[PDB]
Amino acid sequence: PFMWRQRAYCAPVPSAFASQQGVRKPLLRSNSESLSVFSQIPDGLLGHTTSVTMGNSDIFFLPKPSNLLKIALPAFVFMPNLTIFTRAFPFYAHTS
């Protein structure tokens, strides 16, 4: 509230300088309202727009013809076997 001619974002809209226009719309409005989203537009369906959900579409099906294969295939190890040597695991886990 100090530099009015230099701070136009805090100034009234040009329709306010015009001296002409149940309940009526306000006569005085500022440009600082542009810094708010729901100043002029309504807040309708504000907290209900993230609730419109749609399901995924992936199908987990792939025929598994094993009659074509006669050899084994390599397989990964995902976790260490804690059912054996459980008490020493923190002590031998760092080795190889």
Binding site: P74, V77, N81, I84, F85, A93, H94, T95, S96
Partner: protein
């Protein structure tokens, strides 16, 4: 520190083929985008084939190191 060393080695051996397939592919794509004539293209086809063979070599190396790193006695 051994866990960090091991994970670094594992990730490098796992991404080696991805690198060979992606970054060298980008280089080949640059060359394709820039080249127009026929002699250079004739000579560059062989570079592409060499990249094929190199990708397969990297895949073999990664398979070897991964079967070494994911082999457990018990």
């Amino acid at each position: 520190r051994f866990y960090f060393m091991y994970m670094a080695r594992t990730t490098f051996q796992a991404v080696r083929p991805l690198l060979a397939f992606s970054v060298f592919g980008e280089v080949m794509k640059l060359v394709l985008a820039t080249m127009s004539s026929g002699l250079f293209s004739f000579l560059f086809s062989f570079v592409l084939a060499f990249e094929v063979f190199y990708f397969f070599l990297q895949c073999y190396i990664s398979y070897t190191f991964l079967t070494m790193f994911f082999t457990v006695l018990f």
